[PDB]
A paper describes a structure:
Fatty acid kinase (Fak) is a two-component enzyme that generates acyl-phosphate for phospholipid synthesis. Fak consists of a kinase domain protein (FakA) that phosphorylates a fatty acid enveloped by a fatty acid binding protein (FakB). We find FakA consists of three independently folded domains. The N-terminal domain (FakA_N) is the ATP binding component, the central domain (FakA_L) encodes the dimerization function along with a Cys-His-His catalytic triad, and the C-terminal domain (FakA_C) functions to bind the FakB substrate.
The FakA_N structure has a simple architecture comprising 11 α-helices arranged in an up/down barrel configuration. Located at the end of the helical barrel, the adenine is partially buried in FakA_N by the loop that connects helices α2 and α3 and to a lesser extent by the short helices α9 and α10. FakA_N is structurally similar to DhaL, the ADP-binding protein of the Dha kinases suggesting an evolutionary and functional relationship between the two proteins. Another difference is that DhaL has three aspartates (Asp35, Asp35, and Asp37) involved in chelating the two Mg2+, whereas in FakA_N, there are only two (Asp38 and Asp40) with the third Mg2+ interaction coming from Asn32. The FakA double mutant (D38A and D40A) does not complement the ΔfakA phenotype confirming that these residues are important for catalysis.
Author numbering: -2 to 207
Write the structure that this text describes.
C-alpha cells in the first residue's frame, strides 16, 4: 500500500490517547448535557474528561515506543483518577485493553480488535449490575465490529473507521434499551463520550491532530 497503518507502536498509541483525550475534552460540555442516567446530574463529560486527562498526563510525561509499557502508564493514570460511573467504566475498559498488550512492543489490527474485546470483558466483570443502553453496550458493539472487520483488514485506519461506524449505530440504538433515554430523547452520555475518544483514536491513526 502506502498510507496504511499495519502496526501501532507505543508513540502511535500515545498519539491516539492524546487525541482521544483532546477530542473528549472538546466535547465535554455536550456529553455533560446528555447525562440523564442513572442520576440526571449533567456531569458525564466532566467525569470522563477528568479521568482521561489523568491518563493523558501520565502518558505525556512517560513516553515510550514500546506499546506494552505505554499501556501500563496509560492504564495506571486512568485507574488512579477515575471519576463517576463513566470514568470508572472507562478506566476498566482500558485496563483490560492495556493488559492484553502488556508484553508487546507493537500490535497489528487483529490484536487491536482483540484488545477492545478484552476491555469489554474486564468492564462487564467490574460492574456489579451492568445495564444495557450504556457505555458498556456501545463498547461491546464496537468490539464485536472490530473483531469481525479485523479478520480481513490489515489496515488499522480502515478498522478504526469501521469500529466508529458500528459504535455510532449502537449509540443511536441506546434509547431502545434504556427507557429514560427514549422518554427524554437523547442517546447515552457515557457512550457518547466513548465515541468521542474513539474518534480521536482515528485522527491519530491518520497522522492528524484534533
Ligand atoms: N450499571 C451501569 N451499567 C452500565 N453503564 C452504566 C451503569 N451506570 C452508569 N453507567 C454509564 O455511566 C454514564 C453516566 O456516568 P456518570 O455521569 O459519570 O455517572 C451513563 O450514561 C452510562 O453510560
Ligand atoms: Mg458529579
Ligand atoms: Mg452523571
Ligand atoms: Mg495522514
Amino acid at each position: 500500500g502506502s498510507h496504511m497503518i499495519s502496526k501501532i507502536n507505543g508513540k502511535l498509541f500515545a498519539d491516539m490517547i492524546i487525541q482521544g483525550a483532546q477530542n473528549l475534552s472538546n466535547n465535554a460540555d455536550l456529553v455533560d448535557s446528555l447525562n440523564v442516567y442513572p442520576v440526571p446530574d449533567g456531569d458525564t463529560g466532566t467525569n470522563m474528561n477528568l479521568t482521561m486527562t489523568s491518563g493523558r498526563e501520565e502518558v505525556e510525561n512517560n513516553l515510550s515506543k514500546n506499546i506494552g509499557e505505554l499501556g501500563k502508564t496509560f492504564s495506571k493514570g486512568l485507574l488512579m483518577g477515575a471519576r463517576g460511573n463513566s470514568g470508572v467504566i472507562l478506566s476498566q475498559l482500558f485496563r483490560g485493553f492495556c493488559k492484553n498488550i502488556e508484553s508487546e512492543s507493537e500490535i497489528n489490527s487483529k490484536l487491536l480488535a482483540e484488545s477492545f474485546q478484552a476491555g469489554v470483558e474486564t468492564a462487564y466483570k467490574a460492574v456489579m449490575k451492568p445495564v444495557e443502553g450504556t457505555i458498556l453496550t456501545v463498547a461491546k458493539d464496537a468490539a464485536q465490529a472490530a473483531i469481525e472487520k479485523a479478520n480481513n483488514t490489515e489496515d488499522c485506519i480502515e478498522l478504526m473507521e469501521y469500529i466508529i461506524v458500528k459504535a455510532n449505530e449502537s449509540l443511536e440504538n441506546t434509547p431502545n434499551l434504556l427507557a429514560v433515554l427514549k422518554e427524554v430523547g437523547v442517546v447515552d452520555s457515557g457512550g457518547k463520550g466513548l465515541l468521542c475518544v474513539y474518534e480521536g483514536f482515528l485522527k491519530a491513526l491518520k497522522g492528524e491532530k484534533v
